[PDB]
Design a protein around this ligand. Sequence first.
Ligand SMILES: [Cl-]
Length: 226
Amino acid sequence: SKGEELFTGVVPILVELDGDVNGHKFSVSGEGEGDATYGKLTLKFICTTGKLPVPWPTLVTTFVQCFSRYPDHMKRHDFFKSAMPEGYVQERTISFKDDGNYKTRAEVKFEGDTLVNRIELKGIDFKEDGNILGHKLEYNYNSHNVYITADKQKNGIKANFKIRHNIEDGSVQLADHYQQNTPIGDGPVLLPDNHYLSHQSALSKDPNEKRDHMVLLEFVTAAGIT
Ligand SMILES: [Cl-]
């Protein structure tokens, strides 16, 4: 299909995020590339406003599941590529256990030769010295399964999952994610049977980068259908 064909090699990516959490405003720009043949993503993000006012790991899920590797037998379930190049809107509520929540709305779509993810994020009701605004979360990340179900009435998909954020005290902060995707264009897409995306991530730093930043490498593959 047209959408599949857009991803057969390495595709440049651009990420732009405008955030407001507890009324503290911030912006992040990111860039890198995705290779859906390997399910592989490499990305570098810069906070362009100063220090990020929340922990870099709480933004990982927000900052392109179109680059997941769907196995050949699962190719009829790949909603994300089927919506391209016109793209899809990706909304989430992210509820941090005993703390505030983020709401995000992003558009993921090709703008010429580049896959772009443009996000607005608003965060409310955070504790002034909780794990988030206080920056108590470890700079690391765990593997998660993203359970995908069709959302036929929106011609898209929903997903539900909980991110495990390891805290500096040895405890874990859960970040419950509720996700809804809907195509930007009016035509048909692939509506999947229930399955999951296995996402694995590793966060590092560019020891030559003086700006507040995050380097993120990720591998994402679809599974759950035998
Ligand atoms: Cl999981």
